[PDB]
Structure 1
């Protein structure tokens, strides 16, 4: 559980994909996933 301020991922992510809480690591476009 880690506090990624917005960008949890984005497919091709230069770092660890795992946020803290909310509900999900949610898709906007396939290449942009956000901490929602």
Structure 2
């Protein structure tokens, strides 16, 4: 999983695709998505 405020889904993204065990993968823009 990702950390808090980290990335979980973007066009230029390769890190953890799931958000922190206390954070949620909420999409931002069609090129960026982060963990809250």
Q: 1:34 offset after TM fit, Å?
A: 0.2
Which residues of structure 2 form unaligned runs of 5+? none
TM-score for the superposition, normalised by structure 1: 0.47
The alignment's C-alpha RMSD in Å is: 2.6
Which residues of structure 1 form unaligned runs of 5+? none
2:29 & 2:3 partners in 1: Cα distance? Answer: 21
Deviations 1:2-35, CA, capped at 9 Å, x for gaps: 5365112214632441122345211110220000
